[PDB]
Amino acid sequence: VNKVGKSGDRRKARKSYFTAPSHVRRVIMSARLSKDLRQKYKVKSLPIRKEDEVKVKRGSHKGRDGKVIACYRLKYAVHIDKITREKANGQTVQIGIHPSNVEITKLKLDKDRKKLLETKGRRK
Amino acid sequence: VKKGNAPVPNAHFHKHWNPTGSQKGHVRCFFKQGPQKKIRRARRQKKAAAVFPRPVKGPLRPIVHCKSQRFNMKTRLGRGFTTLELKTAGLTDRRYARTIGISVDRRRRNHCEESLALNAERIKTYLSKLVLFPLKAGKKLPEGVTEEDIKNPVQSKQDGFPKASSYGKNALKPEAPRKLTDQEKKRLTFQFLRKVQRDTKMVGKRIKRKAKKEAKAAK
Amino acid sequence: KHSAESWGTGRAVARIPRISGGGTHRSGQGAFGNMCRGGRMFAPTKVFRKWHAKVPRKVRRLAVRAALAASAIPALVMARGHNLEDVPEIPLVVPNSVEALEKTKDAVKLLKDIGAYHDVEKVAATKKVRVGKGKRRNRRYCVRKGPLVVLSKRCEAQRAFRNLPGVDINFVSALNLLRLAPGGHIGRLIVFTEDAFNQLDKVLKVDTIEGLPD
Amino acid sequence: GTGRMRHMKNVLKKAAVRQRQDQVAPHQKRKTAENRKKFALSRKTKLA
RNA sequence: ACCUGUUGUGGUGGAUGUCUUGGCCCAGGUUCUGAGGAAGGACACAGCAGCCUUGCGAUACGUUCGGUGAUACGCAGAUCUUGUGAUCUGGACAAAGGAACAGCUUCGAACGCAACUGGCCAGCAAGGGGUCCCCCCGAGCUGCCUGUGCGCCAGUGUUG
RNA sequence: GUGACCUGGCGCACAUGGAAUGACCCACCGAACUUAAGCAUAUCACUCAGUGGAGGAACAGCAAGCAACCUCGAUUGCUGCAGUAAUGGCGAAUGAACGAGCAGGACCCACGGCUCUUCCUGAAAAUGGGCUU
RNA sequence: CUCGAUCGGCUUUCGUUGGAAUCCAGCAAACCCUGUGGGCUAUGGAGCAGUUGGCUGUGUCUCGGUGCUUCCCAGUACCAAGAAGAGUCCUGGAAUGGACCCACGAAACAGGGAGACUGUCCCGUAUGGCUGAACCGUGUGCUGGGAUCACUGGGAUGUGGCUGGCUGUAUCCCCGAGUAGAGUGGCUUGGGACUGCAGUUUGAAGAGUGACGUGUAUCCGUCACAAGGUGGCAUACAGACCUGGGACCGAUAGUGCACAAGUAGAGUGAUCGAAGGAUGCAAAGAACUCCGCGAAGAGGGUUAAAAGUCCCUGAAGCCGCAACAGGAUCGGUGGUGUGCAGUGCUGUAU
RNA sequence: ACCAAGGAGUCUAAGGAGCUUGCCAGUCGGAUGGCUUCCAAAACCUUGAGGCGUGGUGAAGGCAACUAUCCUUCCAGAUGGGGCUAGUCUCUGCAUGGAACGACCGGACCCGAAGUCCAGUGGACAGGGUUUCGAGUGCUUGCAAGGUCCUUGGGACCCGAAAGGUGG
RNA sequence: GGCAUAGGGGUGAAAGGCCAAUCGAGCCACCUAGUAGCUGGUUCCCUUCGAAGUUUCCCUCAGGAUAGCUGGGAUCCAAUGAUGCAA
RNA sequence: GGCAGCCAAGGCAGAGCAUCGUUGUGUAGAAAGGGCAUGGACAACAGCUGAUCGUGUUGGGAUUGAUCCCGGCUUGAGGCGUUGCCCA
RNA sequence: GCAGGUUUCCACACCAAACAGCGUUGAAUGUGGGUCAACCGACCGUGAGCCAAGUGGUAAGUUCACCGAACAACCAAAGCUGCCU
């Protein structure tokens, strides 16, 4: 017997990934911090958030940058400041980008966000 | 039925032993054996941790000879000591014996002095290997207990004593070479066996013989 | 799980049991048969099949002995596919100081210095996602087998050598033939420590060398 | 299990909470005979 | 032109290959429902909703509170941001404090009697409303078996 | 003087019961297909179906027991006894138990494997009871 | 209302603690003497007589410790989780792929996700932290030292109680009835002149009874003490919930159901009961133009690609069309040996 | 009619006869017991009763395989030894098959119970003969695992009745 | 229109008629994958060996067991050619 | 089946190598005769794959045969294969 | 107007989705409407019949028995009325 919760079952893990709620998709859609942030806060990865800057680092938009404007946790997507695309008609829409591709350039730093940074920064 | 020489089947599976769609079946598969081994071990050590500073089994069992003529010589453990063994050891209160960890069995008696002496000396090596903790932690302290026997209470895995079978496996040990005795030279053991077996068969005959003898004595 | 009856003769269909009832596609369709769709298989697998196998202890111990002899013969270690390029000797013996190893970095340092990290690197490189429907049933990867570290007791070298891909750990107190001859194939690289080596024949209760024909 | 189960679903979710606690760790009563008095006099001094 | 064939191509068709929030199997734990109303069944309830939901009940895809901490999303629409604070989540669910514990139409063991009836416009009745009366609405009580207690009794049962 | 008991009733109050649950359990009830190359006792089977009742387990359980021994010492489960003893148109077939080895003999049970009644004692186990606080 | 005891998955349950305000009672609440309650529990007991031990609020004055809080001094801790999205280049729609010299982690190479094949992209894993629950940092907590408080061991000496063993006696100890059993009938069992059970008739002993696997009578022996009851453990567990796994199946398989499946549908009903998975990396879900009533169609676009909401791929069977080759004859399909056209392949000297 | 996908000697208890492997008068012992993030319900270990085998025979009461240098006998016969010789003699005698036994163990007969003896209730064996039987012995041919072909009970290679029963 | 009679049962001016297109025993679920000495099917290649429809017994005559023929595994033995010359 | 005149070959002792001889039908049935092929476990191939897997389709080659290999095209991975052995 | 149907009734849009063995129409499709009771009926009882109750039967639930103010029982079923209060 293996203990509870720490199971490497493909079917269970995939079920969890595809039926996660929004408070769990918040942490599944985490992104990596830049080296500036990483040295400054001694924290390596955070959940991505609206209103913070990212660099795409992967995909057909690699090397582009911009502020996050929408976390579409239902689609596991992230919409960025100016990564847009015209529809068949002239309507400009947003491209979803999985936040594992992007790295984080700035943070918004709310109260709970600063508290999270401090709590993860104190080395133990 | 075979077109050969194979024995008569004698199969004994005529009564829906098979878990099919229509039947529940009479099959029990012991796939739990592996996991249950570990589970039994875990609950056994939980028993130890629960009744910690005491034998993991816990009551001293007596040693009794196995029952029939086939297992006469094999000894084993009993259920509890006889009150005669307790009184001989020095215990006259069965409930106190039980509370200090000696098992009692009033159903049992000693049909012989050997069992009495054996289990008496068993209880006497107990009660000397035994360190009683005192009630309320600081009152009177018994003899032999040295005030660090209480500091170091060690839970032994097996009860000091040898194996249960090692009491018949010692009576079954021949002597050294010896000289014969003249009765062992004259005695016919087969004749003795046949005599004591013909004895139980000639009983009514050995009454009719006396009756005829005394009738002829009258005449 | 059906109330299927056979229609019998006098009807222009086969005589298989068919679904009773009507008003749906399932009605009239054949049921209760390996040949039928939705019908039971032939000889449904029972759970009281013999899954385990019984080998006498003498024969299992002989298998262990022979697997060790083949590990000692190096024209079979390379045949099974180990790189004996940097391997100084076979069998490989190692000082007992490695049983006090705490880091996988020190484990790989040792394995490099002795000449088995070539095998470890081969395993790590050739690690792949398992071919053919094994990756669906919780067997994701097909990992090859590198060196086997046989220690004398429960020690830190287990956690040391644990993460290294091909390496397996074992103890002379209980030598696993599934590790001494994986796949049934013989001649696996074993890297015994010194006390494990010294206790090998004591544990296996080998008193003599066998007089084998040549 | 084919209807609302508008009470048994709740008692089963409660049982599930209990079961996935006891799977983590066996239960330990917060207040027992050995801590009632301590907790109570602590409460008393703290509120007085 | 028709037929037969062989290629190329286009249709009809859904075989194959690969996978899978599914099943099946084994092991471990629990078994935790109900007259304080269960399991089931109805009828309701969403700005745009029919179905489904181990959603929910006139407080009706939800209420209080806790954990989390900026979404949710198929459209729109005002609320929401270093915050009584979006969303998701937790048995209406944590508080160690005997602090705290909302609500839950209707049939159903189904409980005033019935019922293919929302009938008897049931009996009693706290209250609310329209004008002492009276009128309308009306919470709540009224099921059986059994147990104990209380009240009233029955007997040409035994007695005083 | 208009009672005291006994035995029945009606109303009220406070409570149990009721119903549900594709596994396991307890009590009953209870087939036939099948097998016997037919078939009737036998077999399937003291099973399926049916009725009632649960619990987390149920049932059993510290001997009106086993044995014949150098005795044992609750019950239960496993190994094995054992396809044996025995039953059976002595056909088809059916078929235990004890010895013995184990698990258990910590725990939410226990007067730590017993006790009620019998038996002994006995002014009901002794400063009335009830409702609120 | 206090006081005590008990409980914590908790918010209680119990008590002859005591008190106040009251009501029944009045030889004294009400059940109960047709018996509530105590003693014993058959390898023993009770009475009585005597001894030897221990548990307990102890009145009282001694001594030490542990700590509930508070105050000081000093130190420590407060929780996460490593390693190249490396400088580059190439292919690619997208690098986890490939190339160049150099990089690193591993107690973590279990898994899963991400635009393709990752140890170093994300969640996680191993490990760590908790589990006095607080998982928190101008607020705390822990330890150690010191102090106050909170609480409990060791000695006085009247107790209030108890209670174990041992010796002796002259005294005595009463064990479950329509029961067990038997005749008979029927089921049951391996149980066989009947293992057990049940009806009915009969029906004990208790100065004994039951069992001792061949019915009976006569002797003897062993074991146990029925006709009342409690009673945990090892044990079973195809459902339903919480988990961990698998040499299992992979959409005609695996549950009837991978999906709005016990659904659609059928039957008056009891019941029966299906078919049904996949766009793409991202909806970027096809703008605009011509024609048409319009759907379509022809362009023109998205996209790596139409992969076009019928959407991964798209087999066979069957069909349309074009090209080419033939076309009366079981004089057939197929085989055989050549030939003639069309069409490949292999080798190829100087 | 056509094509596609499915589609029928399977698993289990006991057993038979070969074959393979290990051990040997033993063998096996995974009921259970000791150990050690997942792997691991694995592997390892001899605490192991016991299973099978070492003895058979009789209905049973029961009884129980002779042989003191070694060795049952005979016929055929595998090897090998010592002489000898291209003639060719002796000794060894396995396995297997057949026969025998003046052998023996147990059972059944007949004539007897003579004779010896004592753990002495008169009991224990003992002798000689037979057209005698045994799944008997004569230098123990065993155990365990795997594998192949099979047998019987099971759905039993797959499909297939008219029927019988229980409840609605 | 209401109500009553239910399956070995109902009902019938009797046809064994009728009881939901069902009746010399309705239908529905289960035992049940009932049993079938009978019918049908039983999935790759090559190489080699290769039959019987006859005996006896059987409630036996469409089937079995039993010999025979047919395959395989063997054991003890037997049997089993071949130097161009020159060196 | 190395203790061989030498090279070449063979070199897995139920294999292989050399020479010679015999014999080739077959229903039921069999083979401890030999192989092709499918799903998956344990191992090996430092196997292949976005410089395009698998499927499928069409040609070619190999094979006594079961069947195997390759080119073209489709297609694009939510990959595949070869050898030993084991479970079906 | 019954039973049955259950929105098919009405209007508009709409027939290039499909159905109507056509299709500027329809019981189709989509949207939105419509059914007013002291006097018409259920409801009130009663009939054939049934249930509970009472009691009984069964190993036991029951689609177990009895329905008996013509007609039962093993049965304490008059809970209402007048005056006084």
Exposure of A121 by Cβ count < 10 A (0-12 exposed, 13-18 middle, 19+ buried)?
exposed
Give the span between the Cα atoms of C71 and C181, in whole angstroms: 9
Q: Which technique was the structure solved with, according to the deposited record?
A: cryo-EM
Q: Which residues of chain D have a CB within 8 Å of the CB of A4?
A: 20, 23-24
Phi-psi region of B101 (alpha: psi -120 to 50; beta: other; left: phi over 0): left
Phi, psi (5° rounding) for residue A79?
A: -100, 140
Q: Which of residues 4-33 of C touch strand I (CB under 7 A)?
A: 20-21, 32
Exposure of C155 by Cβ count < 10 A (0-12 exposed, 13-18 middle, 19+ buried)?
middle
Q: Measured CA to C1', what is the nucleotide nearest A11?
A: E21
C195 vs C90, C198, C203, CA distance in Å?
16, 5, 12
Cβ atoms of residues A117 and A36 within 8 Å:
no
- Terminal CA-to-CA distance of chain A, rounded, Å? 31
Strand partners, C94: C193
**CA C9, C14, C18, C24 torsion-angle sign:** negative
Q: Measured between CA atoms, how close is D41 to chain A, in angstroms?
A: 35
* Pairs across B and C, CB distance < 8 A: 5
C41 touches chain B (CB under 8 A): no
Which residue of B lies nearest to C32 if distances are taken between CA atoms?
B21
Q: Measured between CA atoms, how close is C135 to chain A, in angstroms?
A: 9
Nucleic strand E under 7 Å from the C-beta of B29: yes
Q: Measured between CA atoms, how close is C52 to chain B, in angstroms?
A: 11
B32 vs B25, B28, B36, B40, CA distance in Å?
19, 11, 6, 11
Give the length of chain D: 48
Cβ atoms of residues D4 and D12 within 8 Å:
no
Exposure of A97 by Cβ count < 10 A (0-12 exposed, 13-18 middle, 19+ buried)?
buried
Phi-psi region of B93 (alpha: psi -120 to 50; beta: other; left: phi over 0): beta
Give the span between the Cα atoms of A6 and C44, in whole angstroms: 34
Cis peptide upstream of residue C91 (ω within 30 degrees of 0): yes
Q: Measured CA to C1', what is the nucleotide nearest C181?
A: J43
Number of H helices, E strands in chain B: 8, 2
Note whether B21 contacts C40, CB cutoff 8 Å. yes
Give the span between the Cα atoms of B103 and D7, in whole angstroms: 51
The string over B61-99, giving b where at least 16 C-beta atoms fall within 10 Å of a residue's C-beta and e elsewhere, is bbbbbeeeeeeeeebbebebbbbebbebbebeebeebee
Q: CA–C1' span, C10 to G170, in Å?
A: 107
Cβ atoms of residues B106 and B84 within 8 Å:
no
Nucleic strand E under 7 Å from the C-beta of A58: no
Q: Name the residue among C110, C123, C131 with its Cα closest to residue C81.
A: C123
Cβ atoms of residues A48 and A96 within 8 Å:
no
Q: Name the residue among B167, B158, B188, B155 with its Cα closest to residue B122.
A: B167
**CA C15, C18, C20, C22 torsion-angle sign:** negative
Give the length of chain B: 219
B4 vs B7, B8, B10, C17, C187, CA distance in Å?
9, 11, 16, 39, 48
**CA B167, B169, B175, B181 torsion-angle sign:** positive
Q: CA–C1' span, B22 to G198, in Å?
A: 34
C138 touches chain A (CB under 8 A): yes
Q: Name the residue among C116, C81, C108, C109 with its Cα closest to residue C187.
A: C81
Touching subunits of C (3+ CB pairs, under 8 Å) are A, B
Side chain identity, residue D41: L
Q: Measured CA to C1', what is the nucleotide nearest C45?
A: H11
C47 touches chain B (CB under 8 A): yes
**Which helix (H) or strand (E) element contains residue B217?**
helix B205-218
Q: CA–C1' span, B210 to H62, in Å?
A: 28
Phi-psi region of C63 (alpha: psi -120 to 50; beta: other; left: phi over 0): alpha
Strand partners, C6: C17
With both helix axes pointing from N to C terminus, report the angle between C57-72 and C194-204 in degrees, rounded to the nearest 10: 140
Resolution for this model in angstroms, one decimal place?
3.2
Give the span between the Cα atoms of C130 and C100, in whole angstroms: 35
Residue D45's SS3 state is: helix
Nucleic strand E under 7 Å from the C-beta of B36: yes
Phi-psi region of D16 (alpha: psi -120 to 50; beta: other; left: phi over 0): alpha
Exposure of B26 by Cβ count < 10 A (0-12 exposed, 13-18 middle, 19+ buried)?
exposed
The DSSP annotation for chain C comes to: ----EE--SSSSS-SSEE----SSTTTT-B-SSTTSTTS--SSPPPTTS--S----HHHHHHHHHHHHHHHH-HHHHHHHT---SS--SSS--B-GGGGG---HHHHHHHHHHHT-HHHHHHHHHH-EEPSSSSTTTT--EE-----EEEESSS-THHHHHHSSSS-EEEETTB--HHHHSGGG-----B--BHHHHHHHHHHHT--S------
Give the span between the Cα atoms of A72 and A78, in whole angstroms: 6
Cβ atoms of residues C149 and C189 within 8 Å:
no
Give the span between the Cα atoms of A49 and A32, in whole angstroms: 12
